[PDB]
Every structure is written in C-alpha cells, then in structure tokens.
Amino acid sequence: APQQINDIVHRTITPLIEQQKIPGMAVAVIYQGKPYYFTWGYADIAKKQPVTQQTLFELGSVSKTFTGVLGGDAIARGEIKLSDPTTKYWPELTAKQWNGITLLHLATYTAGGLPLQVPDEVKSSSDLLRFYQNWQPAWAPGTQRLYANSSIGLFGALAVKPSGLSFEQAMQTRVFQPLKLNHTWINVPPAEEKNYAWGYREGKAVHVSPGALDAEAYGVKSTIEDMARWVQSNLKPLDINEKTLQQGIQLAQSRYWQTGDMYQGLGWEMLDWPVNPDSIINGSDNKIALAARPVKAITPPTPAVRASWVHKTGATGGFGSYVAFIPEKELGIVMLANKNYPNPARVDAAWQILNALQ
Ligand SMILES: *[B]([O])([O])C1=[C][C]=C(/[C]=[C]/C([O])=O)[C]=[C]1
Hints:
Blueprint (H helix, E strand, L loop, with lengths): L2 H18 L3 E8 L2 E11 L4 E2 L6 E2 L4 H14 L26 H5 L17 H10 L9 E2 L3 H11 L7 H10 L22 E3 L2 E3 L7 H4 L3 E2 L1 H12 L7 H10 L2 E5 L2 E3 L4 E4 L4 H8 L8 E2 L1 E7 L5 E8 L4 E7 L4 E7 L5 H13 L3
Antiparallel strand pairs: 1-2, 1-16, 2-3, 4-8, 5-12, 6-7, 9-10, 9-13, 10-11, 11-14, 14-15, 15-16
PDB class: hydrolase
Keywords: beta-lactamase, hydrolase
Assembly: monomeric
C-alpha cells in the first residue's frame, strides 16, 4: 500500500490497540476505489490463531446496514412501500397503538419508543406477536428517535414477507451473492468455524448468543475483505449491475429524519461533509446515540448526498466494529475488532485516518 496510507493507518491504530487493549484487529481503507488491508493480533488468544484477512468478526449492529439495503431492495422491487402501515404485512397485529405506525417508522426507530432490546423471554413466533401487541408507545409515531433492535429488526422481518423467502435466504440471494460477499454469514457454517474469531469480554472468550430478530438486527459475521467490498458497493452503487439492489443501496442512504446534525437513513446514519469530528465523535458515544431524541421529518426524503460521511457503529458483547465512508471522495474505512471498546475512540481513529487523505 502507498506509504502515506500505511503510515497514517499504523500511526493511528497502533496506539488505539494498546490503549484499548484490543486482542485482535483488522482494518481496511478504500482509497480511490481500491482496498488496502491491515491486521493485528489474535483471532483466538488460547489457540494462538492470528487475525488475517479471512478472519470472521461479529459485525454487531453494522448488520443493520445490510438490513437497510435488503429492505431498500424490496422497495425497489415493489414488494413493500415505506409508507405502508405495519399491519399490511402482519394483520395479526391488531392492538390499536399500531394504527399509523408505518414500515418507515420501524426502519428508522421512530415508531414511538420500541425498546432497544427484544426481551430474552421472547423466543418464538407467538412470543414476538405478543410482545408487539402488548407494547405501549410513549410517543406518537414519527416524533422521536430511539435506536432500537426491536424497531429495525421487525422492519427487516416484515420486509422480506412478500418475497416468500426467509430473511437469511433473501439476504444471501439478494445482497451477499450479487455483491460476491462469499464469506459473510448470518449463520457461520462448520467449514468456516476455523476463521471465526472469538470475541473478548472481561478477558473471557465469547460469541453472540441467539435471540429474537438477531439476524435482522445484529447477527452478521464477515471478513475484512467482504466488508471492504461492502463499503465499495455503498460508495459507488451505480456499479452494481442488479437494478433493484442498486436502487436499494441508494434508498438506504436517503435522509428521512434529522436529529441534531445527524440524518437517519435505512440502517446507515449520515452527516454532511465536511463534518466536525467532535460532532461525529461525541455524537457516537452511547449517551447520545442511544438516547431519546425528537426528529424533524425530511419531507420528502433527500436522495443520497455524495458529500456525506456515512457510517455505523456495531457491537456485540465481544466485538466492536465500525464502518465510515465519504462517497464524494471515494474514501472509506472498515474497523473490526474482537473486543467491544468505546465508540468515540473508533470514530476518532477513523476520522484521523480519512481526514488525512482529503
Ligand atoms: B448494536 O451493536 O448497536 C446493538 C447490538 C445488540 C444489542 C442488544 C442485544 C441484546 O439483546 O442484549 C444492542 C445494540
């Protein structure tokens, strides 16, 4: 890789690994449309397996970006509309609090207070229905944003309903495959277990536990190569030959709501570039990102803005990931680690690297 990239990457990530005690890490910088990889440490401390470009990391919530696109693809196919009420695809949802709550609200965390976590006790199709029937919105729809798995996770599940495909099958067929993300999984197959890094929490090795709507909200695992490719796809969707997917990607980067200087897309979150570091850094901390906040509707939604910083953080009990890219500069970065460390440190590192390249 050009010495410039190599130097800024190493000057930035090295102190990060030491300060945060990150066991293993992979980074990818997309510069002028070309990917450059970097790896450090361990995928498995006990078995001394190093992190390589083939190592799989839990993406955590970055999986929400895949769900936003799959959803957008469904829209481009005319299978769903964001303006359709939730009940059009789940008539069994009869509780009156649901009238007025649209797929857009589920996709954008603006239904009125759906919780972050779906309860552990919710493990079946009937439990899920009961959970949503019983939920009580604290606010009218489309007024406040509350980042939630139970919100976009339901969006993902309802969105693939007309396809007649399972969520995993829709995702494989309509997103992973066309984009050649061949080492990206919702369920890691036996043959790939050997490249599946262990997550580290409090020094103990861990892997994400199964849960309701996990595939739709935080259940994707991937390699630094597939993630770099996922970034290039979102940077330049017009290169995607599959029509509905191309649209879908564009749709996920449209601006539906604004809160502070942040705009909510489908999965992705965007800010106008040039952007202020403190604004994206302080803004990413789990004190702002998860908090209840009023939103102003963007009527109608602004189509994907090329001069934007598009990003998303992700975390599981054992993993910390981050994706950020600037379409107008053909610039992006992917940071995957098997330790869940503070969001501000990720965004800080990512900004130091990308700013240094325009
Ligand atoms: B992201 O990363 O942000 C996320 C993921 C996951 C969660 C939860 C889970 C449970 O259930 O606990 C959150 C968030």
